[PDB]
């Protein structure tokens, strides 16, 4: 779980006994588990996805 920047200063910081373990949480999912290969090529033609990520998804569906 990624912390604060290395240049941070601990003014009014939390307790030194490692209290309040509820930080570092990831954002909600924004992906679909199944697509058509036509849909992959359409995303790239629309500029909405890189060729790199598109190829990666197609290698998982072939």
């Amino acid at each position: 779980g990624p912390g604060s920047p290395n240049s941070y200063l601990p003014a009014e910081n939390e307790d030194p006994d490692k209290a309040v373990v509820d930080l570092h949480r990831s954002p909600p999912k924004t992906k679909d588990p199944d697509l058509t290969p036509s849909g992959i090529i359409a995303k790239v033609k629309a500029g909405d996805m890189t060729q790199e990520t598109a190829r990666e998804l197609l290698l998982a569906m072939r």
């Binding site: 290969p37 036509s38 992959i40 090529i41 790239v44 060729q51 598109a54 197609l58 569906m61 072939r62």
Partner: protein
């Protein structure tokens, strides 16, 4: 021969004989299609680079 070495620029995508399919595609065929995608002069506009 030695050609451009690692120095001089080259526009490597000279083109072959692949064109856009009129229908559905395999996920294998789609890998080959990604290399041919581009814009440039593909649609008329007043915009410029």
């Amino acid at each position: 021969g030695p050609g451009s070495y690692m120095t001089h620029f080259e526009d490597h995508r000279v083109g072959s004989d692949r064109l856009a399919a009129d229908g559905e595609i395999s996920a294998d065929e789609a890998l080959s299609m990604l290399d041919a995608i581009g814009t440039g002069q593909s649609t008329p506009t007043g915009a410029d680079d």
